[PDB]
């Protein structure tokens, strides 16, 4: 019993969008979704943020798989990760959008680059803790491979403690699928 909201980076840098969708797919199909099971909402961000669908638009695990594979990349001349997370926190995770009172809030952030708005990331993360939201962050290192160090510390600072059981690291958009297993069986 836990409402899951995936915060997808859809900026110009993300490529190809096919592997990102293959990731959602391979992850969302292993879940039992329902009003009394586990709900999932997806938010995409770039220069701006947009709700793909709310936590309770779909009550079936299959209805979620079809809608998911229907998500289009919106692009973006910036990677406003802070804006994306903060928007999921105070907009997605709200009763109005399907958040279930009492249930555990879980946020999944996937990005491939340092955010342009990293100056409000600290504040945004702290507000996620204050609302007790478990955070799992996934960093795609493609574009950097340039040290990925500072990039890594930023994405980690997004995941909840302990970092080791919340933060993931993949070589590129293709390697995203090699996480679904560990990712899921760690959200239990």
């Amino acid at each position, epitope marked *: 019993q836990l409402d899951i909201v995936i915060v997808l980076d859809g900026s*110009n*840098s993300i*490529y190809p969008w096919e592997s990102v969708i293959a990731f959602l797919n391979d992850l969302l199909k292993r879940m039992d979704i329902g009003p009394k099971q586990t709900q999932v909402g997806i938010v995409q961000y770039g220069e701006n943020v947009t709700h793909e669908f709310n936590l309770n638009k779909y009550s079936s695990t299959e209805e979620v798989l079809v809608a998911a594979n229907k998500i289009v*990349q919106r*692009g*973006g001349r910036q990677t406003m990760t802070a804006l994306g997370i903060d928007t999921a926190r105070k907009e997605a995770f709200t009763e109005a959008r399907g958040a279930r009172r009492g249930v555990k809030k879980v946020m999944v952030i996937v990005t491939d680059g340092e955010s*342009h708005d990293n*100056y409000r990331l600290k504040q945004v993360i702290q507000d996620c803790e204050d609302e007790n939201i478990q955070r799992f962050s996934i960093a795609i290192l493609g*574009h950097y491979n340039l040290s990925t160090e500072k990039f890594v510390e930023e994405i980690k600072s997004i995941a909840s403690e302990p970092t080791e059981k919340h933060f993931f690291n993949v070589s590129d958009e293709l390697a995203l699928v090699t996480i679904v297993k560990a990712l899921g069986e760690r959200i239990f």
Partner: T-cell receptor, first 107, second 109 residues
Framework: QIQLTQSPSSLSASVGDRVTITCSASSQVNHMFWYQQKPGKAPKPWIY???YLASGVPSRFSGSGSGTDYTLTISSLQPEDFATYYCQQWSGNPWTFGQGTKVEIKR | EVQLVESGGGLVQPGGSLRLSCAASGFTFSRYTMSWVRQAPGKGLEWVAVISGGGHTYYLDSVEGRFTISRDNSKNTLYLQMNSLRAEDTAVYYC???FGDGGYFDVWG
């Protein structure tokens, strides 16, 4: 929207002099970029991610800054550094350049 | 080595149309977001349009509705279709490769 103002608009210095160009943004940005342009030629990538030198850029060049103030510094002005230097930001739309600093060499 | 080469410039009358093209080489073109930057005579640089590797396009106000940026990955070429040209559009147009979300102009022709 973010506007960049470079200062000085132009400057004159002697070889060996330590020169520092400034770029102030109308709103904070977390990175700045610079390009060098010589008369009649395409701009050249000079400094990116605030302080990384593009391949081929001699070691006397460096970049620094944060918030709304970023700089480009030449530790020992050489005669070959005369040019117009442009700062540029990718944090606000539309992406924009500073009006540039034209640097000349004394003799 | 990585390289870009602009083409299509010339004299055109006010109200006329003109199509610019840019051939890229030395890198995996389709994976990069590309842009066009212009410089009017005796003035500064001005970003004009951008297209991501995903096909998403963005524009500078003064040209949106008149210029159209496109790309053809089978030929590793970038295009800029310019309509309703005005005297203020006079300038040297540069094809340019972007880094990250495209805002850092990595390569210039």
């Amino acid at each position: 929207q973010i506007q960049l103002t470079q200062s000085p608009s132009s400057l004159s210095a002697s070889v060996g002099d330590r020169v520092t160009i400034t770029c102030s943004a109308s709103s904070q940005v977390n990175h700045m970029f610079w390009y060098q342009q010589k008369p009649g030629k395409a701009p050249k990538p000079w400094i990116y991610l605030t302080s990384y030198l593009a391949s081929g850029v001699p070691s006397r060049f460096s970049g620094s800054g944060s918030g709304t103030d970023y700089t480009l510094t030449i530790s020992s002005l050489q005669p070959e550094d005369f040019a117009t230097y442009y700062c540029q930001q990718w944090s606000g739309n539309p992406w924009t350049f500073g009006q540039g600093t034209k640097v000349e060499i004394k003799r | 080595e990585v390289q870009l080469v602009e083409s299509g410039g010339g004299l055109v009358q006010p109200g006329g149309s003109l199509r610019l093209s840019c051939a890229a080489s030395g890198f995996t073109f389709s994976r990069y977001t590309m842009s066009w930057v212009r410089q009017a005579p005796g003035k500064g640089l001005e970003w004009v349009a951008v297209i991501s590797g995903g096909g998403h396009t963005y524009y500078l106000d003064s040209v949106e509705g008149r210029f159209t940026i496109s790309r053809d990955n089978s030929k590793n070429t970038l295009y800029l279709q310019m309509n309703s040209l005005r005297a203020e559009d006079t300038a040297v147009y540069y094809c340019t490769r972007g880094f990250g979300d495209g805002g850092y102009f990595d390569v210039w022709g």
